[PDB]
Design a protein around this ligand. Structure first.
Ligand SMILES: Nc1ncnc2c1ncn2[C@@H]1O[C@H](COP(=O)(O)OP(=O)(O)NP(=O)(O)O)[C@@H](O)[C@H]1O
Ligand SMILES: Nc1ncnc2c1ncn2[C@@H]1O[C@H](COP(=O)(O)OP(=O)(O)NP(=O)(O)O)[C@@H](O)[C@H]1O
Ligand SMILES: [Mg+2]
Ligand SMILES: [Mg+2]
Lengths: 340, 340
C-alpha cells in the first residue's frame, strides 16, 4: 500500500534546470511511509528517460552545471491501458499510482501533458486539461477573469494576421505608456518588453510574435506586486501573501484586511479558470487599493527556495506536508472523475 | 509523397456507432491520389485496436448491429518521439503523417486526446487543446462567449458542493420556466431536462449531477434553431445555414441578411473560443431577431447524413473536398506550431 509516485520532470524550457532542482527536492521530502518514487526525466530535446533515484542527475550539486542523465531508457504510453500505462521500450517499470508532473515548457503546462495523462487513466497532481490550457493562455485567462468581474490590466490582443495593422497612436491613446508587450502563451518571461516610447513598439511586437501566435499589449498597472499560493480542488485555501520588490518578502508588509481580500481574489480567480491542486496567483496592489490580477500560474516552482512552497511554509504548511496534500488532491480528483 | 492519414475513431460514447459510420465514410471519400489511411479504433471500454481497412467493422451494413472489430492489435504512443510515434505492441505500423480524430466521448472531445497527439508531435484535424477543452465545457464556453459580447442563454451554474443549496424560487424568479437543466461537460444529450414546473427541478439537478461535476440551469430561449458549419483556422468560413424543426432543413428558410449575420456570429464565436479546423455552431433565432448561441461543437458528425458535411455540400463544398481541406488545415497548423 505504499503508493508509487511518478515524477515527470525536465523539458524544453529555459526553466529546465528549475524542474531538475524541483524534482530533487520533491524526492527528498517525499514521505517514505507513503510513497516510492519513479523518475521520468525529459531532456531539452523532448526525449523521455527513466532514471534511478540516485542517478537521475549529472553535476547535481553544481547549479551552473546540473543536468539530466539521459539514460536512454525510453517510455511507452499505452493509451486506454488501465494498468502499467507507462511502459519501458526495452524490461519493466513499477506501476505508477499518481503522476506529479513538473514539466516546464509549453507542452508540460498547456494541458497537453495533462491530456496524455488523462488518456492513460493516471491520476496526476495539478490543474486538469481545461484549467491548464486556460491559465496558460493569458489572453483567454484575462477574458475569463474579466467576465468573473475580477480586475485585469486593460489590453489588446493581436495575432500575426492583425499585428501588421497595429496602430500605435490609438494604443497609446487607449492604454497609455509604458505598454507591456507579451506573448499570450508563455514559456514566458521570454518576449516580454516594456515599451517606453512609441518607437520601441514595433520591435516589441515582432519579438513577441517570434514566440507565439498571439501577443498581448497591456496598460501599465502601477502598484505593488503580491504573490499568493493556492491549494486544493473544490475548496481551495490561500497562503499568506508575499511581496515582490525590485527580492521577495514573506510575509508581505500589508494589512490583514488587504491580505484577506487578496486571498479571496486568488481563490475566486483560481475557481473562475477552473484550476486544481495548485496555483500561484500574482496580483498588483494599487494605491487605491484595487487589486488587479497579473497572472495565474498552474505550474509554480518546487525548489526549497521557490516562492510557492515558501508561502505555504510561512502559512504553517511544510514542504513534506505540501507534497503529500498535492498527491491526495490528485487521487481524490481521479476517483471523483472515475464515476462520471 | 502520398500522406498517411491516421483515423482514430470509436470510443465510450453513446455516439460510438456514429463514429464508426463517420470513419467508414471518411475512408471512402479519402482522395486516393493524396492519402493512405491507417485505422485505429477505440472500443466501448477504451481499448485501442489497429485494423485493416477492409475489416475494421462487424456488421458494417446493419446500422442496428454495426460494431468495431476488436482485432486486439494494441497501440503504443511514444511521448516525445519524432517518428513512428504510434507503435504496435506486438510488428510495424505505417508512419502516420496526420491524425483525423473522430472520437466521441469525454476524452476524445475535451482536449485530452488532442494533448496526447500534441505530446507525440502528430498533426491532427480539429481544435487544439484549448479550443476543445473550452468549447466542451459549456459553462466556460458561455462565459467566454458572453465576454465576447455574444448572446448566450442566461444561466446559473451549480456544482455538487453548491447544488445542495439551490433555491428554486429564486431561479424561476431569475430565469423563468421552463428551465433547461444540463451538465456542463457533455458527452451530451444525456442528463438534459426541460423542467416545466418547480417540482420537476430537484430531480433534473440530481440526474445532471450523475453525469458531471457542473450543471447549467438556463432560461428558455424562444426562437428557431439554426445550425451553421465553420471551417479553417486563421480565417474561418461559414457554410449556409440549416434549420432544425420538430428534421433538418437546408438551406434554412431565412433572410440572406439574417443568414449573413448568423454566419458572422458563428465565426466570431469560433474565434472567441479559439477553435480550429472545424465546428458546428447551433444558435437560436429570436423573433427580434436577436441571435443567441446555444452550442459550439468542435466534433461534428461526419457521416454522409450528418448535418456538418451536408451544410458544406449545400455551400458548394463536397465531402471529399471537406476531408482534404481539414487535412490541409491540420498540416498548416502543425508547421506554424513547429517554429514557436
Ligand atoms: N501591465 C503591467 N503593468 C505593470 N507591470 C507589468 C505589467 N505586465 C508585466 N509587468 C512587469 O513585468 C514582469 C513580467 O511580466 P509577467 O507577465 O509576470 O511575465 P512572465 O512571462 O510570466 N515571466 P515572470 O517575470 O517570471 O513572471 C512582472 O512581474 C511585472 O514586474
Ligand atoms: N436554454 C434553452 N432554451 C430553449 N431550448 C433549449 C435550451 N437548451 C436546450 N434547448 C433544447 O434542447 C435541445 C438539447 O440541448 P443541447 O444543449 O443541444 O444538448 P446536447 O447535450 O448538445 N444534445 P443535442 O440535442 O444532440 O444537441 C436543443 O436542441 C433545444 O431544442
Ligand atoms: Mg507573474
Ligand atoms: Mg446543440
Amino acid at each position: 500500500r505504499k503508493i508509487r509516485v511518478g515524477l515527470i520532470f525536465g523539458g524544453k524550457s529555459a526553466e529546465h534546470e528549475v524542474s531538475l532542482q524541483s524534482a530533487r527536492n520533491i524526492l527528498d521530502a517525499l514521505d517514505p511511509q507513503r510513497f516510492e518514487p519513479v523518475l521520468i526525466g525529459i531532456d531539452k530535446q523532448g526525449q523521455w528517460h527513466v532514471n534511478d533515484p540516485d542517478s537521475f542527475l549529472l553535476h547535481a550539486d553544481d547549479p551552473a552545471r546540473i543536468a539530466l542523465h539521459r539514460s536512454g531508457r525510453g517510455v511507452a504510453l499505452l493509451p486506454g491501458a488501465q494498468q502499467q500505462q507507462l511502459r519501458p521500450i526495452q524490461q519493466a517499470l513499477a506501476q505508477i499510482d499518481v503522476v506529479f508532473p513538473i514539466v516546464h515548457g509549453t507542452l508540460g503546462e498547456d494541458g497537453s501533458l495533462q491530456g496524455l495523462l488523462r488518456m492513460a487513466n493516471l491520476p496526476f497532481v495539478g490543474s486538469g486539461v481545461l484549467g491548464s490550457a486556460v491559465a496558460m493562455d493569458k489572453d483567454m485567462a484575462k477574458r475569463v477573469l474579466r467576465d468573473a468581474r475580477l480586475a485585469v490590466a486593460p489590453f489588446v490582443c493581436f495575432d500575426r494576421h492583425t499585428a501588421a495593422h497595429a496602430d500605435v497612436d490609438t494604443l497609446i491613446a487607449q492604454l497609455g505608456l509604458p505598454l507591456f508587450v507579451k506573448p499570450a502563451n508563455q514559456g514566458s518571461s521570454v518576449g516580454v518588453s516594456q515599451v517606453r516610447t512609441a518607437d520601441a513598439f514595433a520591435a516589441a511586437l515582432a519579438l513577441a510574435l517570434a514566440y507565439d501566435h498571439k501577443v498581448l499589449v497591456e496598460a501599465a498597472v502601477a502598484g505593488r506586486e503580491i504573490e499568493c499560493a493556492v491549494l486544493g480542488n473544490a475548496v481551495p485555501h490561500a497562503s499568506v501573501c508575499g511581496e515582490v520588490v525590485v527580492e521577495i518578502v514573506i510575509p508581505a508588509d500589508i494589512d490583514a484586511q488587504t491580505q484577506q481580500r487578496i486571498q479571496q481574489i486568488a481563490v475566486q480567480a483560481y475557481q473562475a479558470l477552473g484550476c486544481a491542486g495548485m496555483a500561484r496567483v500574482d496580483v498588483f496592489l494599487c494605491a487605491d487599493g484595487r487589486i488587479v490580477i497579473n497572472e495565474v500560474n498552474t505550474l509554480p516552482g518546487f525548489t526549497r527556495i521557490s516562492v510557492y512552497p515558501k508561502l505555504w511554509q510561512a502559512s504553517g504548511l511544510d514542504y513534506r506536508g505540501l507534497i503529500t496534500r498535492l498527491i491526495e488532491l490528485a487521487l481524490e480528483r481521479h476517483t471523483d472523475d472515475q464515476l462520471l
